[PDB]
Design a binder for this molecule. Structure first.
Ligand SMILES: Cc1cc2nc3c(=O)[nH]c(=O)nc-3n(C[C@H](O)[C@H](O)[C@H](O)COP(=O)(O)OP(=O)(O)OC[C@H]3O[C@@H](n4cnc5c(N)ncnc54)[C@H](O)[C@@H]3O)c2cc1C
Ligand SMILES: [Cl-]
Length: 486
């Protein structure tokens, strides 16, 4: 008979899952498996992103239980667990969503050689991305595009991406009964305390497909806001209602399908003729995700500077003091320190908010390597995507794609043009709650009498600015011009 396995790595969803529909077709027993390493903390990861994964895993378990099935969370490594369950469950087909990451290509190639020895058919459909990224490189001549202007004109030449896959049946083939490896006491979704964490998460974004589909409809409640979306015109100092969709964590883990997001955008665009065009449009932002995935998958060492052909070699300085003050939110600038606080509390910031802290650390003030800043974002960001985190940090550090190093974000004026009262700063930095708005961006300029009255003395309660921007920026700007001369 047909007994299949639907492997969950990304694509933690039931909607638009071509790998799940194949594993349920003509099947007698389907096995939904998520391979979890219980020693992942003995090898860098925050409790916000990992608990976001667990909350997303409980969404699958509730969806499988409501359809007569059950999610299996197997412990160990995939190279050591799958050969055991291939013979124990009598598997003839293995389906999992395709992945284009470096570790995934080596991991999957190991699983492919194991299923061949066992006689298991491997089906790997694409659904994490809009298009087949390898197809885009072939149509473009064998090389991937390096500019958004050339990439946007390539996806328009191919046309619309494949429509989202249909929903799975309301009743799925359950796993076989009385299986030792499918025992609930060893295949249950663990909590954040049981995986080896001590402090609870503080984020306000709950993971899961049900939460992803709810935030999608909320974003589409106002179709005029969707059609007239322009990314550079959004408010980075908005936290009560974030001025963007905040769908990056659900798209990263796979709780939300990009194909369904793109299909919902065209329904609004077809009825709104004057809708925004890429790259500033909402569809353009998805094309940014497609563009970086196409370039990074074909470029070696895309997450590094050495051995990376698309990244310019820059003599980044080794300054642990500036790196520690930046990652611990004690640089003296309330606009920068509040964003880093929002990073360790929520795990998500506005794109322009990430622009200020990335510019301040790299080509702007501290001249610290973008890799050291990417590793800090890799820990706390609940939307940690290998290819976006890299191409965007190379963007803000003038290492790739971007080449206008004279544009330096002022860590004082940028936040003040959106929020002069400093509501964003008073929320994440409560030590400056009573500071007047006149000095809330430059607390060192406030008189001592104002510092005493507001309850925040610069040097005792809030640290002094580590650098003078006018002195640090001109130094970094001149060094970038000397680098580009090479
Ligand atoms: C230094 C730096 C690091 C970043 N690291 C990440 C990361 O690890 N993961 C991540 O998802 N994005 C990353 N980004 C991109 C961007 O900041 C986020 O995608 C955005 O803030 C998420 O908000 P949203 O979901 O409301 O986006 P929206 O504006 O609503 O866009 C919708 C979707 O489009 C995609 N998208 C939007 N902006 C970009 C972009 N600039 N590049 C690629 N795809 C984009 C995302 O999938 C996003 O969910 C980074 C940007 C910078 C400057
Ligand atoms: Cl500015």
């Amino acid at each position: 008979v047909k007994n299949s396995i639907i492997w969950f790595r990304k694509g933690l969803r039931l909607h638009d899952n071509p790998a799940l529909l194949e594993a349920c077709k003509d099947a007698k027993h389907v096995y939904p498996v998520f391979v979890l390493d219980p020693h992942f903390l003995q090898q860098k990861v925050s409790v916000n992103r990992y608990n976001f994964l667990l909350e997303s895993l409980e969404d699958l378990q509730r969806s499988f239980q409501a359809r007569g099935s059950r999610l299996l969370v197997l412990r160990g490594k995939p190279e050591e667990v799958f050969p055991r369950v291939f013979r124990e469950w009598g598997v003839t087909q293995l389906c999992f969503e395709h992945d284009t990451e470096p570790y995934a290509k080596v991991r999957d190639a190991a699983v492919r050689r194991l299923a061949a020895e066992a006689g298991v058919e491997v089906v790997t459909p694409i659904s994490h991305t809009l298009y087949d990224t390898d197809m885009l490189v072939a149509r473009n001549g064998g090389a991937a595009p390096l500019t958004m202007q050339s990439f946007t004109k390539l996806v328009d030449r191919v046309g619309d991406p494949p429509a989202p896959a249909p929903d799975p049946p309301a009743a799925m083939p359950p796993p076989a009964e009385d299986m030792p490896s499918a025992a609930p006491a060893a295949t249950g979704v663990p909590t954040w305390q049981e995986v080896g964490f001590k402090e609870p998460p503080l984020t306000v974004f709950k993971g899961g497909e049900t939460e992803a589909l709810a935030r999608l409809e909320a974003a589409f409640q106002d179709p005029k806001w969707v059609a007239g979306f322009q990314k550079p015109d959004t408010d980075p100092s908005a936290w009560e209602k974030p001025a963007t969709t905040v769908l990056s964590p659900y798209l990263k883990f796979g709780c939300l399908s990009a194909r369904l997001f793109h299909a919902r955008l065209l329904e609004v665009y077809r009825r709104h003729p004057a809708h925004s065009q890429p790259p500033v449009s909402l569809r353009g932002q998805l094309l940014w995700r497609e563009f970086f995935y196409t370039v990074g998958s074909t470029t070696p060492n895309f997450h590094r500077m050495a051995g990376n052909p698309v990244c310019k070699q820059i003599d980044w300085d080794d300054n642990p003091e500036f790196l520690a003050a930046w990652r611990e939110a004690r640089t003296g600038f309330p606009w920068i320190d509040a964003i880093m606080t929002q990073l360790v509390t929520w795990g998500w910031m506005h794109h322009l908010a990430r622009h200020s802290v990335a510019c301040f650390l790299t080509r702007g003030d501290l001249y610290v390597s973008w890799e050291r800043g990417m590793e800090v974002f890799e820990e706390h960001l609940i939307d940690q995507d290998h290819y976006l985190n890299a191409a965007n940090w190379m963007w803000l550090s003038a290492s790739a794609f971007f080449s206008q190093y004279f544009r330096v974000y002022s860590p004082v004026v940028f936040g003040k043009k959106y929020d002069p009262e400093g509501r964003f700063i008073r929320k994440f930095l409560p030590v400056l709650k009573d500071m007047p708005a006149k000095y809330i961006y430059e607390p060192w300029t406030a008189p001592l009498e104002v510092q005493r009255k507001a309850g925040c003395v610069v040097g005792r309660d809030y640290p002094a600015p580590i650098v003078d921007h006018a002195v640090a920026s001109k130094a970094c700007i001149a060094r970038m011009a000397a680098a580009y001369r090479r």
